[PDB]
Amino acid sequence: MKNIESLFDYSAGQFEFIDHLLTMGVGVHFAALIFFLVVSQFVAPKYRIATALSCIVMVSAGLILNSQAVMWTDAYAYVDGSYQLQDLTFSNGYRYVNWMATIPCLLLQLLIVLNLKGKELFSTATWLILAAWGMIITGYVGQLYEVDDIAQLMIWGAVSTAFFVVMNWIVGTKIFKNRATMLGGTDSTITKVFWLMMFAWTLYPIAYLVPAFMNNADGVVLRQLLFTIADISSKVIYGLMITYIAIQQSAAAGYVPAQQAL
Ligand SMILES: CCCCCCCC/C=C\CCCCCCCC(=O)OC[C@H](O)CO
Ligand SMILES: CCCCCCCC/C=C\CCCCCCCC(=O)OC[C@H](O)CO
Numbered sequence: 001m002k003n004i005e006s007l008f009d010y011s012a013g014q015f016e017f018i019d020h021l022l023t024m025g026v027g028v029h030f031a032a033l034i035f036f037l038v039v040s041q042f043v044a045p046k047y048r049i050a051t052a053l054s055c056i057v058m059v060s061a062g063l064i065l066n067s068q069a070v071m072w073t074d075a076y077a078y079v080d081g082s083y084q085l086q087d088l089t090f091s092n093g094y095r096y097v098n099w100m101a102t103i104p105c106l107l108l109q110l111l112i113v114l115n116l117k118g119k120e121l122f123s124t125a126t127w128l129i130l131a132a133w134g135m136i137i138t139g140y141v142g143q144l145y146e147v148d149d150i151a152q153l154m155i156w157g158a159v160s161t162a163f164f165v166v167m168n169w170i171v172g173t174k175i176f177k178n179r180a181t182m183l184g185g186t187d188s189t190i191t192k193v194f195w196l197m198m199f200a201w202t203l204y205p206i207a208y209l210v211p212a213f214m215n216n217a218d219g220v221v222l223r224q225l226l227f228t229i230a231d232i233s234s235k236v237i238y239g240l241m242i243t244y245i246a247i248q249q250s251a252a253a254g255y256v257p258a259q260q261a262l
């Protein structure tokens with residue numbers, strides 16, 4: 001009842017489009033899961049955890065998208081020409097809780113292919129995960145107010161954005177100071193990964209703000225469309241680039257299975 005989805009009835013077209021976006025997302029993530037599993041054998045031991053992390057991200061996100069899809073169909077029934085709320089079973093809060101797990105995985109796979117190790121790896125991962133959890137937790141509290149108190153959504157969102165900015169500064173600083181260590185020309189690729197991340201991750205706060213600027217049933221659809229674009233870009237496309245970097249550096253380091261695969 002704290003999310004705008006509960007305020008509206010939906011046309012068949014709106015309801016089915018949201019359902020199809022979520023189910024398509026499930027399929028894309030589980031198809032990518034198989035790809036990452038199969039190619040892990042072509043990654044040198046030093047980087048193989050990066051591809052395993054993509055597998056974990058695919059199943060984590062795919063399970064949450066599947067849960068959202070079933071919750072969506074459980075919550076609404078077609079009555080008198082529209083889909084109307086029957087049960088309090090749908091909310092976006094499950095996405096936020098899941099980010100507590102998937103964001104650390106996405107960040108850790110980056111640090112691994114950047115060739116960080118030992119104390120710098122552990123220290124950098126700790127600050128990044130704390131910053132990310134601060135961003136997620138404050139955003140989670142903010143969206144509890146997207147119906148009742150837009151001013152509160154905005155203030156928690158400002159606090160969350162401060163964590164996002166500091167997190168991005170840590171990431172960008174480590175990338176630019178370490179790309180010279182990267183093998184096989186991936187010093188160029190990693191810069192594109194950073195820009196892909198900046199673009200894709202910024203779509204999430206835009207979705208968070210939909211209740212402030214498009215508080216209607218079409219805004220509900222737009223938010224799910226933005227989450228879909230952002231999920232595929234930040235998890236699947238990003239994961240494919242991380243895997244490319246991992247295989248390319250593996251081959252440059254003399255790992256035969258990587259050399260033959262390329
Ligand atoms: C009264 C309410 C409380 C107000 C306070 C809440 C807001 C504080 C937010 C950010 C400050 C922390 C930023 C400090 C981060 C420095 C550590 C760091 O980033 O290390 C990166 C390094 O590159 C890796 O080795
Ligand atoms: C809540 C409202 C507060 C609004 C606050 C607005 C300030 C935005 C500024 C920067 C965004 C952070 C983007 C980080 C981009 C990476 C920067 C970086 O990596 O620096 C390069 C490095 O110095 C080379 O060695």
Ligand SMILES: *C/C=C(C)/C=C/C=C(C)/C=C/C1=C(C)CCCC1(C)C
Pocket residue numbers: 099102103106135136138139140157160161164201202204205208230231234235
């Ligand atoms: C696969 C999921 C990903 C990459 C999720 C990323 C989420 C964010 C970058 C969330 C950012 C937020 C803000 C910067 C302020 C508004 C609240 C958030 C949590 C939506």
Ligand SMILES: CCCCCCCC/C=C\CCCCCCCC(=O)O
Pocket residue numbers: 045046047049108112121122125126129130
């Ligand atoms: C309060 C929360 C703090 C969370 C900190 C998490 C720390 C994680 C640190 C690094 C994990 C990396 C483990 C795998 C190392 C891979 C390196 C390799 O095998 O080449």
Ligand SMILES: CCCCCCCC/C=C\CCCCCCCC(=O)O
Pocket residue numbers: 149150151154155157158161205208209
């Ligand atoms: C996620 C990015 C967050 C950006 C920070 C928000 C910037 C705040 C700008 C002006 C706030 C104006 C407050 C007006 C409250 C409206 C109350 C209402 O109409 O219900």
Ligand SMILES: [Cl-]
Pocket residue numbers: 060061064095098099102
């Ligand atoms: Cl997720």
